[PDB]
């Protein structure tokens, strides 16, 4: 159970994203990538918390911002394929 | 390094995404999730190939279609926090 964060500033590093979301609980993994769907320089990120309670705290807080962008964290539930 | 596929049909399963891209090369990992940025139903996908050469073959093909949707795979380079 991950959180997906779209619309990140190009200046947002994975450490920056980690630092923001660690205020809500223990982070198991935090990754950013440049969003390849636009030439506008922006990123998206995925945050994995150790405790699902942390997701509720994020979703409950009505305003989030990071590196001059208003962000809107969403839940994401990846489904992996088996080997062929 | 992964390929990002936006705009998947809601019907596209992980296995279908895997079977489509396996035509271009060996797969390390393949996942699908609901795109949480729309109220209607669509997916996005992430495919990790064993060999980057497979990415070139995907990028070079002019038209891709999966479960009746045009898809336009892009390259992505995830960076993890320390």
Residue numbers in the entry:
A (entry chain A): 1 to 84
B (entry chain B): 1 to 82
Paper's wording?
We obtained a high-resolution crystal structure of the MSI2 RRM1 which allowed us to utilize a newly developed computational molecular modeling algorithm and perform docking analysis. We performed docking analysis to identify a putative binding region. Based on Ro’s ability to compete for MSI-RNA complexes, we hypothesized that the binding site is likely to be shared with the RNA binding site. Thus, we predicted a stacking interaction with F66 and R100 with Ro. Also, the K22 side chain and the NH backbone group from F97 formed stabilizing H-bonds with the oxygens from the aldehyde in the C2 position in the pyrimidine ring and the aldehyde from the opposite ring. To directly test our docking model, we mutated the putative interacting residues (K22A, F66A, F97A and R100A) and determined their ability to bind to Ro. This resulted in significantly reduced binding (F97A KD 69.5 ± 14.7 μM, R100A KD 148 ± 65 μM, F66A and K22A KD > 200 μM compared with 10.5 ± 0.3 μM for WT). Importantly, the single mutations did not disrupt RNA binding to MSI2 whereas the triple mutant completely inhibited its activity (KD > 50 μM). To provide additional evidence for the docking model, we performed NMR chemical shift analysis of 15N-labeled RRM1 and observed three main regions with structural changes by titrating MSI2 with Ro: (1) K22 region (with M21, I25, G26 and W30 shifts), (2) F66 region (with S61, G65, F66, and V67 shifts) and (3) F97 region (showing V95, A96, F97, and R100 shifts).
RNA-binding proteins (RBPs) play critical roles in cell homeostasis by controlling gene expression post-transcriptionally. MSI2 is the dominant family member in the blood and is expressed in 70% of AML patients. It correlates with a poor clinical prognosis in multiple hematological malignancies.
